[PDB]
């Protein structure tokens, strides 16, 4: 099969001791197929694009606030993740036994991208403050202009 590789293929005679001898459920022969998915298709077409696009939301921290394109990048990453979620929604049943691994990663990525959008909003809010709207305290200057840049090894 183009998607499934057979790992184990046992056969067993199963006898139910609890069932009566005159029951059809007393005996059966079961042939089991343990099959591993060959994940190359999903890797190439879904996982690498989704993972790379999700990791793209981190570049917004290196984008300057004057570019005016930070939140657009972040929300577009969220939109792309939603498109990928639409893609996955057609390929698996809506079962409740577990969240799929790709589902777990997608939920984790959408949550992180949401926090990144919120962080971008806060950063833009801080960037555009002026004396006519906000007061810049000396403690804030000491923390954010001298101590943290020295700790963070900023230029």
């Amino acid at each position: 099969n183009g998607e499934w590789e057979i790992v184990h293929r046992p056969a067993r005679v199963n006898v139910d001791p609890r069932a009566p001898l005159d029951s059809p459920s007393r005996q059966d022969i079961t042939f089991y197929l343990i099959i591993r998915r060959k994940p190359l298709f999903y890797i190439i077409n879904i996982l690498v694009p989704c993972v790379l696009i999700s990791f793209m939301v981190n570049l917004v921290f290196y984008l300057p606030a004057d570019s005016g394109e930070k939140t657009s990048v972040a929300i577009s990453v969220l939109l792309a993740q939603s498109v990928f979620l639409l893609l996955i929604s057609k390929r698996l049943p809506a079962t409740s036994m577990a969240i799929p691994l790709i589902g777990k990663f997608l939920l984790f990525g959408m949550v992180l991208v949401t926090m990144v959008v919120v962080i971008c909003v806060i950063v833009l809010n801080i960037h555009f403050r002026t004396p006519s709207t906000h007061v810049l305290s000396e403690g804030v200057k000491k923390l954010f202009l001298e101590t943290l840049p020295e700790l963070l090894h900023m230029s």
Binding site: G68, L79, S96, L107, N125, R129, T133, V135
Partner: protein, 230 residues
């Protein structure tokens, strides 16, 4: 063989007599089954909550960034994608509306209003000082009264004759620019106050609506008895 989407709550059987010769009894087996909604929580509800949070946070974005429209409208676009996702799953009958569809349309209405109110805020912010005169009542409400409640404290010899005329003209032009900038600052402060008011209003409306819908969903329990009294 257990089903991954349904849990069997009750499974009785009943003999149904004909209404008191061509009449026939029935034996009805009832399956009362509760859906296990983890898939829809992961794939629909959580993204809607995140998009709603971003719609709330639009109002904290400064007008000068020039990014309110992009954020709010792309949130709406993402919600449209999730409508496309739900189109393949929801029932197609018309006797009532699914609560998930109600939540999705509530979210889309919220994001639409976030777009509308962000447009209003930007209209106030970019208002031309010379063409638009601030009415006094706008001043009294949005510059004096409301900032107190919203916890917004606004901080705080022909040559010589020609030279004198040029210097006086330069000073006059800079004073005109100062007055224009003061009126522009007043309009921008009004826009900021209105933005904060909308932020608090949107938080309140979002929380109340989400709580109402989520409590309606959570307290919808399966019947304790298969045949309740009616």
């Amino acid at each position: 063989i257990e089903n991954g989407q349904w849990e069997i709550i009750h499974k009785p059987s009943r003999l149904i007599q004909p209404p008191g010769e061509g009449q026939r009894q029935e034996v009805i087996f009832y399956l009362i089954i509760r859906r296990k909604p983890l898939f829809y929580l992961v794939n629909v509800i959580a993204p809607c909550i995140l998009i709603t949070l971003l719609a709330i946070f639009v109002f904290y974005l400064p007008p000068d960034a020039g990014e309110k429209m992009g954020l709010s409208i792309f949130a709406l676009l993402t919600l449209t994608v999730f409508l496309l996702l739900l189109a393949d799953k929801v029932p197609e009958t018309s006797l009532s509306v699914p609560i998930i569809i109600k939540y999705l349309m509530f979210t889309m209405v919220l994001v639409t209003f976030s777009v509308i109110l962000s447009v209003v805020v930007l209209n106030l912010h970019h208002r031309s000082p010379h063409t638009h005169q601030m009415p006094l009542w706008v001043r009294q409400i949005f510059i004096h009264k409301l900032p107190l409640y919203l916890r917004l404290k606004r901080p705080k010899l022909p040559e010589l004759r020609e030279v004198v005329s040029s210097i006086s003209y330069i000073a006059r032009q800079l004073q005109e620019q100062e007055d224009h900038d003061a009126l522009k600052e007043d309009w921008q402060f009004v826009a900021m106050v209105v933005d904060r008011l909308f932020l608090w209003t949107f938080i309140i409306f979002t929380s109340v609506g989400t709580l109402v819908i989520f409590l309606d969903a959570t307290y919808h329990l399966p019947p304790p008895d298969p045949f309740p009294s009616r």
